[PDB]
Amino acid sequence: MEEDIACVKDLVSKYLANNERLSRQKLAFLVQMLLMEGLKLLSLCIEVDSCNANGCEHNSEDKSVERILHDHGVLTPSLCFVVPDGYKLTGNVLILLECFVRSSPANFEQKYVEDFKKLEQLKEDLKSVDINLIPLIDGRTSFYNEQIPDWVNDKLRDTLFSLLKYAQESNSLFEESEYSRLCESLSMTSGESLNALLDNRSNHYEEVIASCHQGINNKLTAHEVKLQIEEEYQVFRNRLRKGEIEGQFLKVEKNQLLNEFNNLYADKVAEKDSVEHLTHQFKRASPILRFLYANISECQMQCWRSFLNKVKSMRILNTRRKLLLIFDALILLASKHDQVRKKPLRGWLGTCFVSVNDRLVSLESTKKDLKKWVERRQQVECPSKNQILNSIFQKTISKATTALRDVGISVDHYKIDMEVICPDGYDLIMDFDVEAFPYIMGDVDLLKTTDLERLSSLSLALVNSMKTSSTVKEAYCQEFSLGETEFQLIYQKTGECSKCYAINDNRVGEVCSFYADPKRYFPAIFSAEVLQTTVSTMISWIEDCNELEEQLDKIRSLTKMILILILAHPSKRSQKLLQNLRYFIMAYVSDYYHKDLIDKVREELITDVEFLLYRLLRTLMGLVLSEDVKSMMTNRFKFILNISYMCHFITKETPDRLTDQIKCFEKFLEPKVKFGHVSINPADTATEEELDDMVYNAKKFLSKGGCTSAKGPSYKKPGVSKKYLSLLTSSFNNGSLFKNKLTALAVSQLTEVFSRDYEYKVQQAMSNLVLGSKQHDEILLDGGASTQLKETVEKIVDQYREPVTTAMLKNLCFYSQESPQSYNSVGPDTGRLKFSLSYKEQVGGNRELYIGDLRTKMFTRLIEDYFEALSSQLSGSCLNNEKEFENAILSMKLNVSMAHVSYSMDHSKWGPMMCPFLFLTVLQNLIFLSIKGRDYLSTLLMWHMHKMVEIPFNVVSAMMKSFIKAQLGTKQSITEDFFYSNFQIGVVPSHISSILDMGQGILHNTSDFYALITERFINYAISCVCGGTIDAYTSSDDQISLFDQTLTELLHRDPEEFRALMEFHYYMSDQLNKFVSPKSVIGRFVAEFKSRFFVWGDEVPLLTKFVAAALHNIKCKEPHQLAETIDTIVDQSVANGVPVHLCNLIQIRTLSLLQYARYPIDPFLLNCETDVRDWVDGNRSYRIMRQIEGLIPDACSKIRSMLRRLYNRLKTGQLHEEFTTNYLSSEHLSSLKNLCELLGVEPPSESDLEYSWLNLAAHHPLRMVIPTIVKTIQSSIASGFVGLCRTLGSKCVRGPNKENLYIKSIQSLITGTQGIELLTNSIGVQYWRVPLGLRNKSESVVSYFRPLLWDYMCISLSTAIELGAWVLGDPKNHIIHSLRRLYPSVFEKHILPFMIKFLDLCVALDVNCEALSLV
Amino acid sequence: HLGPQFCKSCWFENKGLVECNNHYLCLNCLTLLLGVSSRCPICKMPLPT
Ligand SMILES: [Mn+2]
Ligand SMILES: [Zn+2]
Ligand SMILES: [Zn+2]
């Protein structure tokens, strides 16, 4: 036994790092178990490599944070005890290190998030002691190091494993748990089933299984099922023709639908309004609407303001308020000197002016404070009250020039004209002195873009006000310009929240005041022409109507009013109204509809503006859908569908997340309380009572008394019948289907005052203190870290009740204690699949999201892939495979082209009403002809049945606050009563396990499979009972059913039998968990599927949807990536329905947004001269090539001839692809002439060769807080855009020496040259023409410039490779193999960190020619 | 051959239809669309008499 021991002792004595420490471990081991110390030396090598790689001091003596803080003299109270691996002290900056090694990704991520939790707890604790710490996590998935060779370490580990073959170590020590974790730590599992678990399932599993088997047959014959179906259909038809069952489908009457829509909101809307009165009332509805249509009739101060704003970010002096005062005096003098010469007052409002940091300061306050300051400076000592200010102004301007010169701002570029500093400054500053709507409400016609332009100016002012830093009259203000006038938007509140703005003017004073939300007026910032043009297009759709010609002008005015109203007032209620309008118009042209349609279309509206929008919509529909139209219904339907989809213009983000979170929790909880399974505190260590309730609810879920009962089927009730489930199972089995204490005292006193700043204090006290007594743990520790705690909690509760060997040293090195070893009927002995509930933003209504840890993720992934394999064996579903979805589209087009009936169904409450137990039951009864695997799926579904869901902290805190307010100081909701009843006994809801909850996404494929089999069975039953086939296509939320000729002629000849069949379909679907939603429609002309509408086999454009999507999607990333995103979106839009003019205008709007951000537009950004050929059969590279051809029209022809000859000689001529890979790595400007001489074509002259473009990302990419091909394979919109505008002004570009600087410095250094001309064509493409004399001569700014002809050749060759050789005409996988072959080092680093054919040019033309990604 | 027996304009009349170049129109739609131009607003082809 000692043979291998002495062998490893020799090995550690010969091969070991003897730097200064590991020799101590060597001498401590050699005196001493082999496997443990082998792992220990390995992990210690990992740790020393970690601390030397991260420059941290090694923490070897197991010193915790208290020891480190005591060794430095910091006295701290009782906090968390955590020991780091390394520490680094720099004043008030501590660097902590935690290292671990894991083989399974689950345990790795678990320890990652656990270390994150402990480090955030430590940071929050030391923040209460004002000690700033920076965390560092060293997670190493491998065992490699830099001390022992790789194969030597592998041989060491193999010797450990071969010494593990004995039995003395296993029986003397290494108990089952620790030995198992040690063996799994040295293994290489890296977890497809993982069945090597300790199965100790109790009898409850068999109870649940027998529950799914009792009463159900699932072994019937294919003939008895038909007889039962026929008899059930007969009984159903009889009970309907009698009247015991209510009808669910009504025939459509256009007159009745219009009358029911007009009479909507009859209790608050008066009656039908005329167009003239509508236009009269609209122009004076809201303050923002009053500002519009109001008929409202260099820059030395602006230069000084901008200059002082530029020097304000660098913090030149620790005199913040004094710097503000000095800058105020300077801007005062500048405005004086600019207003005396020729200019009127531009930045004045009356006894107040706009100073630096775009804030309004009153002139009297400036004079007073400057007087106090100058007198206080004069008390200490002759200067005659003006030499002091003159000297200090000289000091400030000198310091500013120095602080801008080291970075190269070149102050002279600001056109300051620094002469305003006069000796008589003190005197000139002291002697300086300057129905309720003032204007006429309503003058502008609804045909000019003046209103849209004013709206754009106002929205830009709002979004620019959103970013006020607000350091330390105090009212801030932005300025927005206009024509003969310019106004100021004043505001006191700061941040990105919604506030109250005031539009003011200098000549008249206050003009408007309104409470608005800044982050919502984005889609109208620069959309001056695109909106007018899209409205013109929508009107031109129905322009050739021949029946609305006498009213089309009114129609246009109405549409424009709707648009301006939803843009100036973005409200979720308007969005919901427009979506319900979409549903209505969808159900208007059909043949049958649901009786609950109108109750769903009606949405509660407040604020008196939504009523105006509703009146506008009603009038518009009355005009377009009048009784005597009877012509081209297609165009009118498309028009109304776009008017409904106009909801996309409003941002899909939520105004306030608390209310939407409460709404999501209400939708989550209502059906559970309606059913009767709301078990609280699931108690992971399973008790018997919860199991009894679980099995009882499972038994109740299966009753669902069918139509053969006395009362009848109770619709919209959750539950599945036994008879129909048995029929389904039997039909599938045979071949038939597929075939702080002071604050607390102040809060208490404020509560007492309110009974017989303080309100927020009391709210925070109640949210952070009352929850301590119900601690049930993120927010609980967050509140505990902000506060002694026990005594304060006890006093608060009293005052509120008055008025009424598995050690540690081997646990961080070799093995982990986080892995499941056994599993029972509830879970893997560690957690019963705990999820957390969150909300996802959508257009109409937010959706739910169940987020879980990595173990739950992989379990659900296993179930999902298994059921996806099951479904792929079929050919009915279309969810995640493009082929079946394309086939569904083709079949739908073919069926609609023949005027067949189409049943578009949506299913209400698909999430909360489904059940895992139903899946388990329908699984346990199938055969699945070809046990391992099936029992695993069964127990996984059983785990899914016992599921914990964590209640969000926001909603429970809100309910606690409401309960406190109700106990201290009215139609309470269901969840409100639930929370109150739970609080009345002391317990607070932390997790609510229930039966009736299918995760929204976590069980997607299994739900799709269940829906597929159920719908197939339903269609089979309908076919066998009537005599007609039915095709079905599902998407796990909503589906389409396509009928054959027999059902069409049946509907044409018998409406009663058709509605009987439809109600029977509804009844059978409700017998399952397939509640048909009232949005469902049975129409023979229009068909809806996955937001795709088909009217006559074609597809509706949905223009406004794509237009809003393009106007919305602007992220804060690198500008070229933003251009790529916009190009992809505009490609999609032009592909579906959008014409070329709107898309060109969107591109120009994006370019204008980029110009406002002060960016050097380069020609490789966008092409806004489209003649639409490059969107159908062209990529982005072809568009950029077309733009460059438009830029330089002469050299492009020569280069295209050269490349045409080269491509012709390449595809079918002499082989040249072998040397081009190296030829394209030399000097480009010389290589062009070389290749032109080699091919025989005349090279371009010097004139048409010196053209270059400015690439700021030539040395390094922009710091948007090596090629790009090796990296691509690895808040809100307004916030993103304003962050983009903020970074592109700061030190964003990097130099060759890895130094940061401003873009303005680059333009300044370019202006210090005599060669370039800076010529642009029409819209600011901004391409330079630097000569080749200074070309890369003395490491000047010419290094940033890159020649245009070389990149043009690159892109033209890329397009020639991608799409044919016709692109060269006159205008009238294995890639990683090539990467590793050509760039070995680049293939080693930044490539695969966690993972002949004529393509070598596709990878060679981008690793060196830095133009695009090309792939 | 041709499509279904309906007027592609009003979507609801199905009695007494006259054949276009490739489909059917009702008499009311025909006399209503004869006043704008001679070209079929759907087929982009001249309408017969
Ligand atoms: Mn749908
Ligand atoms: Zn017609
Ligand atoms: Zn026609």
Domains and CATH numbers, chain A: 2-185 (3.30.70.2640), 254-290+528-650 (no CATH), 298-434 (no CATH), 1113-1274+1283-1407 (no CATH)
CA nearest to A1086 within chain B: B11
Q: Which 8-state DSSP code applies to residue A455?
A: H
CB atoms B33 and A546 under 8 Å: yes
Residues in chain B whose Cβ is within 8 Å of chain A: 3-4, 6, 8-11, 28-29, 32-33, 35-36, 41
CB atoms B3 and A897 under 8 Å: yes
CA gyration radius for chain A? 37
Cβ atoms of residues A1044 and A900 within 8 Å: yes
Strands (E), A363-473: none
Experimental technique behind these coordinates: cryo-EM
Question: Which residue from A546, A897, A899 is facing B32, i.e. has the nearest CB?
Answer: A546
Smallest CA-to-CA distance from A1341 within A1379, A1380, A1293 is with A1293
Smallest CA-to-CA distance from B31 within A550, A546, A544 is with A546
Q: How many angstroms separate the CA of residue A1095 from the nearest CA in chain B? A: 11
Ligand closest in space to the Cα of A844: 1
B6 annotated binding-site participant: no
What are the C-alpha distances in Å from A387 to residues A329, A372, A391?
Answer: 15, 16, 6
CA nearest to A627 within chain B: B10
B43 annotated binding-site participant: yes
Angle between helices A1055-1071 and A1045-1053 (to 10 degrees): 120
Pairing assessment for the beta strands A592-594 and A132-140 based on DSSP bridges: unpaired
Smallest CA-to-CA distance from A1115 within A1283, A1280, A1292, A1287 is with A1280
Distant-in-sequence, close-in-space partners of A440: CB < 8 Å, separation ≥ 6: A294, A295
CB atoms B33 and A589 under 8 Å: no
Question: Which residue from B3, B35, B41 is facing A632, i.e. has the nearest CB?
Answer: B41
Cβ atoms of residues A973 and A980 within 8 Å: no
Smallest CA-to-CA distance from A1132 within A1099, A1096, A1168, A1107 is with A1107
DSSP B5-39: SSBTTTS---SSEEE-SSSEEEHHHHHHHTTT-SB
Q: How far apart are CA A37 and CA A633, in angstroms?
A: 83
A607: left (phi over 0), alpha (psi -120 to 50) or beta: left
Q: 3-state class of A89 per DSSP? A: strand
Site of tokens 């906090």: A79
B5 annotated binding-site participant: no
Question: For residue B28, which residues of chain A lie inside 8 Å, CB to CB?
Answer: 630
Q: How far apart are CA A1112 and CA A1316, in angstroms?
A: 37
CB atoms B6 and A899 under 8 Å: yes
CB atoms A631 and B10 under 8 Å: yes
Token pair listed for A430: 């002291």
Give domain limits for chain B. 1-49
Token pair listed for A453: 């332009």
Cβ atoms of residues A1143 and A1133 within 8 Å: yes
- Scanning A802-952, the segments in alpha helix (DSSP H) are 854-872, 882-897, 910-913, 916-924, 934-945
Site of tokens 């178990």: A33
Question: For residue B11, which residues of chain A lie inside 8 Å, CB to CB?
Answer: 589, 633, 1085
Token pair listed for A815: 């093995």
CA nearest to B12 within chain A: A630
Catalytic site residue A111? yes
Top residue of B5, B8, B11 to mutate, by most chain A CBs within 10 Å, is B11
Smallest CA-to-CA distance from A1220 within A1400, A1360, A1350 is with A1400
In the reported structure, the alpha carbon of residue A895 is separated from the centroid of ligand 1 by a whole-number distance in angstroms of 18
B42 annotated binding-site participant: no
Q: After which residues is chain B broken (C to N over 2.5 A)?
A: none
CB atoms A630 and B33 under 8 Å: no
Q: How far apart are CA A587 and CA A1326, in angstroms?
A: 53
Token pair listed for A1185: 């090539």
Q: How far apart are CA A567 and CA A522, in angstroms?
A: 9
Q: How far apart are CA A1262 and CA A1256, in angstroms?
A: 8
CA nearest to B6 within chain A: A899
Q: How many angstroms separate the CA of residue A635 from the nearest CA in chain B? A: 9
In the reported structure, the alpha carbon of residue A1103 is separated from the centroid of ligand 3 by a whole-number distance in angstroms of 25
In the reported structure, the alpha carbon of residue B24 is separated from the centroid of ligand 3 by a whole-number distance in angstroms of 7
Question: For residue A634, which residues of chain B lie inside 8 Å, CB to CB?
Answer: 8
Q: How many angstroms separate the CA of residue B19 from the nearest CA in chain A? A: 17
Q: How far apart are CA A1226 and CA A606, in angstroms?
A: 69
Question: Which residue from A589, A633, A899 is facing B9, i.e. has the nearest CB?
Answer: A633
β-strand partners of A836:
A851, A950
Ligand closest in space to the Cα of A905: 1
Q: How far apart are CA A1079 and CA A924, in angstroms?
A: 34
Question: For residue B35, which residues of chain A lie inside 8 Å, CB to CB?
Answer: 546
In one letter, which amino acid is A1322?
A: S
Q: How many angstroms separate the CA of residue B36 from the nearest CA in chain A? A: 7
Smallest CA-to-CA distance from A148 within A34, A4, A15 is with A15
**Burial class of residue A1314 (count of CB atoms within 10 Å of its CB; 0-12, 13-18, 19+):** exposed
Instruction: Tell me how crowded residue A165 is: count the other CB atoms within 10 A of its CB.
Output: 8
Top residue of A542, A546, A588, A894 to mutate, by most chain B CBs within 10 Å, is A546
Ligand closest in space to the Cα of B23: 3
β-strand partners of A101:
A140
CB pairs under 8 A between A and B: 32
Strands (E), A237-329: 249-251
Q: How far apart are CA A891 and CA A874, in angstroms?
A: 17
CB atoms B32 and A898 under 8 Å: no
Exposure string over A244-276, b if 16+ CB within 10 A, otherwise e? ebeebbeebeeeebbeebbebbeeebeeebebe
Determine the longest span between alpha carbons in chain A, in angstroms: 118
Q: How many angstroms separate the CA of residue A546 from the nearest CA in chain B? A: 7
Question: For residue B36, which residues of chain A lie inside 8 Å, CB to CB?
Answer: 544, 546
In one letter, which amino acid is A487?
A: F
CB atoms A898 and B4 under 8 Å: yes
Q: How far apart are CA A670 and CA A678, in angstroms?
A: 10
Q: How many angstroms separate the CA of residue A545 from the nearest CA in chain B? A: 9
**Which residues line ion ligand 3, judged by CB < 5 Å?**
B 20, 23, 40, 42-43
Q: What is the dihedral of CA A43, A44, A45, A48, to 10 degrees?
A: 130
In the reported structure, the alpha carbon of residue A262 is separated from the centroid of ligand 2 by a whole-number distance in angstroms of 26
Q: How many angstroms separate the CA of residue B42 from the nearest CA in chain A? A: 9
CA nearest to A1096 within chain B: B8
Ligand closest in space to the Cα of A1034: 1
Token pair listed for A207: 């109870």
Q: 3-state class of A847 per DSSP? A: strand
Question: Which residue from B6, B29, B41 is facing A544, i.e. has the nearest CB?
Answer: B41
User: Which of these is catalytic: A26, A40, A111, A395?
Assistant: A111
Q: How far apart are CA A1204 and CA A1372, in angstroms?
A: 16
CA nearest to A1085 within chain B: B11
What are the C-alpha distances in Å from A854 to residues A112, A685, A992?
Answer: 11, 21, 21
CA gyration radius for chain B? 10
Distant-in-sequence, close-in-space partners of B30: CB < 8 Å, separation ≥ 6: B18, B47
CB atoms B35 and A546 under 8 Å: yes
Question: For residue B27, which residues of chain A lie inside 8 Å, CB to CB?
Answer: none
Question: Which residue from B3, B11, B32 is facing A633, i.e. has the nearest CB?
Answer: B11
What are the C-alpha distances in Å from A1313 to residues A1246, A1248, A1309, A1331?
Answer: 19, 20, 7, 11
Top residue of A543, A590, A630, A637 to mutate, by most chain B CBs within 10 Å, is A630
Pairing assessment for the beta strands A86-90 and A93-101 based on DSSP bridges: antiparallel
Q: Output A785-794 pairs: Cβ under 8 A, ≥24 positions apart.
A: A785/A121, A785/A124, A785/A125, A785/A127, A785/A128, A786/A128, A786/A740, A787/A740, A788/A740, A788/A741, A792/A740, A792/A741, A792/A744, A793/A769
